[PDB]
Amino acid sequence: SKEIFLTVPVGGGESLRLLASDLQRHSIAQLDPEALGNIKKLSNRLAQICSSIRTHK
Amino acid sequence: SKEIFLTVPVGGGESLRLLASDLQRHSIAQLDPEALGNIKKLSNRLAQICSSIRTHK
């Protein structure tokens, strides 16, 4: 494991392998309703951590 | 694999396991300079896909 990726199990079984070096839109737009919710929260919460970090200091 | 998580290899070896159900801030603030860059892009690009999807239609 060298590259970064997200694991979003389609529905509730097989886990998906989507690398950040590409981040396919459809791969996420083909998930289940419950999945879309998790993803949205993933980016939202994450975005908060970044700003919280001091990169200008 | 049922829960969603991100894999950010610290420096360049062992991959990290950070679930989205918690998303630890420090775990990301302790990574390497090259890692922080990838993460920031991960959330940015992802955020675009969401808005691209039609959830109001």
Swiss-Prot record, chains A, B:
GO biological process: one example: positive regulation of mitotic cell cycle spindle assembly checkpoint
Localization, UniProt: Nucleus, Nucleolus; Cytoplasm; Cytoplasm, Cytoskeleton, Spindle; Chromosome, Centromere
Modified residues (Phosphoserine): 1, 15, 21
Record keywords: Cell cycle, Cell division, Centromere, Chromosome, Cytoplasm, Cytoskeleton, Isopeptide bond, Mitosis, Nucleus, Phosphoprotein, Ubl conjugation
Coiled coil feature spans: none
Post-translational modification: Phosphorylation (probably by CDK1) promotes targeting of the CPC to centromeric DNA.
Modified residues annotated as Phosphothreonine in this record: 7
Tagged with keyword Oxidoreductase: no
Role according to the record: Component of the chromosomal passenger complex (CPC), a complex that acts as a key regulator of mitosis. The CPC complex has essential functions at the centromere in ensuring correct chromosome alignment and segregation and is required for chromatin-induced microtubule stabilization and spindle assembly. Major effector of the TTK kinase in the control of attachment-error-correction and chromosome alignment.
Further remark: Cells lacking CDCA8 display a slight decrease in histone H3 'Ser-10' phosphorylation, suggesting that the CPC complex mediates phosphorylation of 'Ser-10' of histone H3.
Protein name: Borealin
Species name: Homo sapiens
Lineage: Eukaryota, Metazoa, Chordata, Craniata, Vertebrata
Encoding gene, per UniProt annotation: CDCA8
